[PDB]
């Protein structure tokens, strides 16, 4: 009944296309939620897509100026993976920052809403509010924007409070059936940890997070589920995964400290280890969220000064718009598969022919077989779409 | 299988955000029902949201003059909590006055419709009409407009028939599987009882109602399930919960009688006791249904002179529009949690920019943990919304 994730990691030679919602394309005719910060999380039967709605549809007067991340009307929308966020979509909680879990018995939703100085994180398990916690740093309390991990009924969530470049307090919360049973502060060599892409690595949980002040290498949070001990580091690959970043020739990583290379901003991304190698995804553009590529770096999880790419895949063409990406794990017959989603942001602050900001997603799953090439962009033409 | 609500009440330090439907904001683009008088009730698995529809969507020629309370086209809509009342919403009965019950086995719906002076109350259990009763005072027969409470298969509903400005005939109906097994005339010191917010206080049921005749203090109805005994009083707290009312300096309560302080009108509200203290919600504005606050009055359930407030939360900002509010109880793992909803009325007779009257809902649930501040209003811009 409680998911433990004790199976090994599936052998991955790459990723195969899994899902695509065409949300913006369907918005032109039809009522589709305005969403951002999506993620995918699966119960032991089927996968679900989540997103932070803006309390409006796209062909709506209220979709004007929907670029802001924190409004009182943002709610966590939840459909089956594949079903676009139509008007029948269930918004499961109030949140401008969210994280969702299925422990094998019920869904856990971590939902943060309220004032910036005074934010509340509500913990909803099996459809009921079981616990709530207030901001500890009295700043913008934020969480992963992706799936959290549960092992033996204990779910772990990374929550950050403070400024993304000033002092920020990151805590790991251990939640059992919606109740916060333990809270451990972040310890280790990583300092700015945000929007962690966490995945189960039995007997623990490993998170690859986003650094917003100093590093273009991604921080790593290792969580021992038994002892509740936290270890922090960075990804060792010389090909860093954060945007902005430096070229592949001029970039560097340290993987015990930030690389201090164009690290003053970031984007949510993912990476997972394959022995000494690392599978990672990033934008093709080093400065903007344009395009998306995945590849495997040889000894990129253990040795810095490694820039040996292999098995590169283009998920989104370099000319097309990408956004947040994250990892989610699907239990298989005999192993744990790693899958990822890419958020395809369309709209304001980069495309000024419309007044709204929204996204679609494309989902890829790890495969042991063969695959071809392609590109799966959003595909909506904003010049003809309602403004 | 039958719900007995035998668990104690959960320790409540306040309330955390639970749900927000954004109905009016989604109405601007998309087909959303025009509703009023909503409430929340939960089966042992999920929470559902109910509302009295007006037989029309908002972007509709029939949304004109939806400020009328009783029309032949009003039906009780029933969706999962979070799913907005879209066109796929099920209307479970014809009703301009409603109350819904889940006894642990099936849903009970008490639906009142027909002529104002010859109204019919239908009792629908497990999708069947089991019983029916006619208005006994030949005036507007009305009911709680919130969830009713079932203990051990016996559901109790409070029904009133009579005048809103004078003495009315209030009856308590004991219903078993849709069948009225007993009808008790209201007994006690409460003089006018209307729109009761009832919660299970095992072994009985406690209802906090509105006095529309002569009091701004809320009447209490105590119902013994085992004995079918009825006891009536008033919420003793000097900080009265009804609207209209006097200011916090001049408000008073008698704890046995109406306070005769701006008691000629009222709004549906809620209150529950925590030992000698009372947790109550009310509009921030004394005369209008603007804003919503929840707080705890120290010794407010026993002392008619206590005005000691604590644990105040702002649910809806002072300048924003509130409406009906009511209580609903959720069984947890070890106790019974108290949750409340607030109706966010928008439209006519207060906002003349539109021809329709409708509402949104925001839901909060009791919590033993910590929480911050915030405000969650309807948020629709009626100047740009279709009329």
């Amino acid at each position, epitope marked *: 009944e409680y998911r433990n994730w004790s199976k090994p990691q599936c052998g991955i030679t790459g990723f195969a296309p899994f899902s695509k919602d065409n949300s913006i394309r369907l918005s032109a005719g039809g009522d589709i939620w305005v969403t951002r910060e999506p993620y995918v999380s699966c119960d032991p039967d089927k996968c679900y897509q989540f997103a932070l709605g803006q309390g409006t549809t796209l062909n709506n007067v209220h979709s004007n100026n929907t670029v*802001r991340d924190r409004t009182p009307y943002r709610t966590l929308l939840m459909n089956e993976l594949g079903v676009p966020f139509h008007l029948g979509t269930k918004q499961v909680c109030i949140a401008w920052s969210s994280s969702s879990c299925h422990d094998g018995k019920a869904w856990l939703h971590v939902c943060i809403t309220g004032d910036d100085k005074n934010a509340t994180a509500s913990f909803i398990y099996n459809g009921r509010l079981v616990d709530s916690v207030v901001s500890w740093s009295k700043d913008i309390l934020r969480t992963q924007e992706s799936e959290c991990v549960c092992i033996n009924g204990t779910c772990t969530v990374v929550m950050t409070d403070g400024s993304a470049s000033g002092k920020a307090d990151t805590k790991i919360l251990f939640i059992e059936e919606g109740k916060i049973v333990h809270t451990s502060t972040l310890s280790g060599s990583a300092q700015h940890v945000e929007e962690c892409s966490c995945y189960p690595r039995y007997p623990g949980v490993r998170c690859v997070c986003r650094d917003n002040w100093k590093g273009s290498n991604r921080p790593i949070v290792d969580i021992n589920i038994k002892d509740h001990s936290i270890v922090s580091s960075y990804v060792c690959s010389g090909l860093v995964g954060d945007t902005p970043r430096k070229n592949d020739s001029s970039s560097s990583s340290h993987c015990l400290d930030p690389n201090n290379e164009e690290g003053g901003h970031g984007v949510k991304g993912w990476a997972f280890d394959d022995g000494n190698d690392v599978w990672m995804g990033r934008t093709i553009n080093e400065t903007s969220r344009l395009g998306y590529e995945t590849f495997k770096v040889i000894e990129g999880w253990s040795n810095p000064k490694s820039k040996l790419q292999t098995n590169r895949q283009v998920i989104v063409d370099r000319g097309d718009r990408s956004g947040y990406s994250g990892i989610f794990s699907v239990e298989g017959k005999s192993c744990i598969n790693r899958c990822f989603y890419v958020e395809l942001i369309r709209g304001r602050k980069e495309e000024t022919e419309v007044l709204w900001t929204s996204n679609s997603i494309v989902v890829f799953c790890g495969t042991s077989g063969t695959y071809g090439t392609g590109s799966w962009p959003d595909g909506a033409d904003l010049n003809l779409m309602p403004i | 299988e039958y719900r007995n609500w035998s668990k104690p009440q959960c320790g409540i330090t306040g309330f955390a955000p639970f749900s927000k439907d954004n109905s009016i904001r989604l109405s601007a683009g998309g087909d959303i029902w025009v509703t009023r008088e909503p409430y929340v009730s939960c089966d042992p698995d999920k929470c559902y949201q109910f509302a009295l529809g007006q037989g029309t969507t908002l972007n509709n020629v029939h949304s004109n003059n939806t400020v009328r309370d009783r029309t032949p086209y009003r039906t009780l809509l029933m969706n999962e909590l979070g799913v907005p009342f879209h066109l796929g919403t099920k209307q479970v009965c014809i009703a301009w006055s409603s109350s819904s019950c889940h006894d642990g086995k099936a849903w009970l719906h008490v639906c009142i419709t027909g002529d104002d002076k010859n109204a019919t109350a239908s009792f629908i259990y497990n999708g069947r009409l089991v019983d029916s009763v006619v208005s006994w005072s030949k005036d507007i027969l009305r009911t709680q407009e919130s969830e009713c409470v079932c203990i051990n298969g016996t559901c109790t509903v409070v029904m009133t028939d009579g005048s809103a400005s004078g003495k009315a005939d209030t009856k308590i109906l004991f219903i078993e599987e849709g069948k009225i097994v007993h009808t008790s005339t209201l007994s006690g010191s409460a003089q006018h009882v209307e729109e009761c917010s009832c919660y299970p206080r095992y072994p009985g049921v406690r209802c906090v109602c509105r006095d529309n005749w002569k009091g701004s203090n809320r009447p209490i109805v105590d119902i013994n399930i085992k004995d079918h005994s009825i006891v009536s009083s008033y919420v003793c707290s000097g900080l009265v919960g009804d609207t209209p009312r006097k200011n916090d300096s001049s408000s008073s309560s008698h704890c046995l009688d109406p306070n005769n302080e701006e008691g000629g009108h009222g709004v549906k509200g809620w209150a529950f006791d925590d030992g000698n203290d009372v947790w109550m919600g009310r509009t921030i504005n004394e005369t209008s249904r603007l804003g919503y606050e929840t707080f705890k009055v120290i010794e407010g359930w026993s002392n008619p002179k206590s005005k000691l407030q604590t644990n105040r939360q702002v649910i809806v900002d002072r300048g924003d529009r509130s409406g009906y509010s009511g209580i609903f109880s959720v069984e947890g793992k070890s106790c019974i949690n108290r949750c409340f909803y607030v109706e966010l009325i928008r439209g006519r007779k207060e906002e003349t920019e539109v021809l329709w009257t409708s509402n949104s809902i925001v839901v909060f649930c009791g919590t033993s943990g910590t929480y911050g501040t915030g405000s969650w209003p309807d948020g629709a811009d009626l100047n740009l919304m279709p009329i």
Partner: antibody
Amino acid sequence: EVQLVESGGGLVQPGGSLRLSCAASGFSFTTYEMNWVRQAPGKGLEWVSHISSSGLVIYYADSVKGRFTMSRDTAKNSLYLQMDSLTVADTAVYYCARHYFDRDWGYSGMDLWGQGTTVTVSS
Amino acid sequence: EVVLTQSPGTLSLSPGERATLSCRASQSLGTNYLAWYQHKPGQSPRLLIDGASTRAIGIPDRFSASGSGTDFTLTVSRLEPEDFAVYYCQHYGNPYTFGQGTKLEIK
């Protein structure tokens, strides 16, 4: 619709005190950064002070540091600039400006401005 | 200690030419936290360009801006009698600083 209205400007004696107030109409102070910007007569815009949506004062102009106190009260949705020991280099039109900090995108430009209030320090 | 230097001063054109407004930073900003404002006399300053490249909501399509590093440019493609005002470039990253401004005159 959103609006910013300042008040409290007027003649002040050099070495005196004045409290400027700016009120918000449509939006909420709990999610926006707020700023004070002054324009000296015959000079360009100067950023006086900046307060976060969390209530912390990130920035003070070097000239006004130690003399100007900027605060807010989210209950009344009002912004305050307590000016102390005013000199002749403080007479200017004072603007309360609003910009946003995005969790994802960081800071944005100051898109909402008030009408402006005039402070005159003479003799 | 960035010093936002607006290269053109008291520039004069005609209703329909192209305006080239320059803003030079003493040192590399390190981010896109460069904004342009329009300040007509007797009116509140109006945000035109945010992020050194993004036009604000409701700003006419004529206003466009570009640049990075130290040099940032604002260009009005076709002048109109409304577009004659004082233009400021602001660095809303650390350290906060405004530009001295540049005014458009009628010829």
